[PDB]
Amino acid sequence: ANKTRELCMKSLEHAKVDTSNEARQDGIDLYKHMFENYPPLRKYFKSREEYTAEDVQNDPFFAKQGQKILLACHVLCATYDDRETFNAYTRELLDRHARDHVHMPPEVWTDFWKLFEEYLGKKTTLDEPTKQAWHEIGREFAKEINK
Ligand code: HEM
Numbered sequence: 001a002n003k004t005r006e007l008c009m010k011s012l013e014h015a016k017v018d019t020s021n022e023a024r025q026d027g028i029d030l031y032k033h034m035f036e037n038y039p040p041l042r043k044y045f046k047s048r049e050e051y052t053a054e055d056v057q058n059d060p061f062f063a064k065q066g067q068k069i070l071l072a073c074h075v076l077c078a079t080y081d082d083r084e085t086f087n088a089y090t091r092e093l094l095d096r097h098a099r100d101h102v103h104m105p106p107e108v109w110t111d112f113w114k115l116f117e118e119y120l121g122k123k124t125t126l127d128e129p130t131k132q133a134w135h136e137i138g139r140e141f142a143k144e145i146n147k
Contacts, residue, residue, distance in 0.1 A: 001080075002081045004077075004080060005133075008080070009077055010130075011120055011126055011134070012073070012077065012120075014120065014123040014124040015070055015120065015123055023067065024067070026070060026123070027062070027063055027065070027069070028062050029119070030066050030069065030116075031065065032057065033118065035055075038115060044104065073116060080137055080140075086140070087144050091144070093145075106145060109142055110142050113137075113138030117135075
């Protein structure tokens with residue numbers, strides 16, 4: 001519950017979502033990690049599909065997009081202790097991809113939390129309790145997305 005929320009919130013002090021250049025770069029590096037290490041997910045990215053980490057670094061789109069997804073991870077663990085808000089927000093995340101026809105097999109949402117934890121691991125050293133807490137948010141998000 002609230003200890004999971006607390007351990008997740010603090011590993012997130014290392015990924016900024018403010019206005020600085022730091023945050024713009026943390027949003028970009030996340031997409032660098034998925035494009036260079038999960039190449040199948042690049043195809044859901046409309047005419048950026050054969051992008052490399054390189055191409056991802058200089059396109060202004062990933063600076064904005066990176067901020068959209070880093071804010072959604074920060075919102076899912078600050079709402080974890082109120083499951084009604086947490087579940088409602090996960091449904092809206094689904095609805096917002098469906099809005100724009102980004103339809104994804106339910107096992108890509110599970111792959112995401114393996115990708116996020118690897119990305120944060122480059123940003124800070126996660127200890128086993130914190131890794132444990134991200135697994136639990138990941139697991140619950142995945143069941144909810146699965147309806
Ligand atoms: C599970 C964690 C994820 C979160 C928290 C997340 C969050 C978001 C958010 C907030 C948006 C923006 C919607 C808007 O404009 O209002 C979005 C768009 C998008 N997401 Fe995700 N996303 C996730 C995973 C994925 C995955 C695994 C893929 C597939 C590679 C994906 C592909 C996209 C694409 C292509 C868009 C549309 C970009 C555009 O506007 O052109 N997302 N996502």
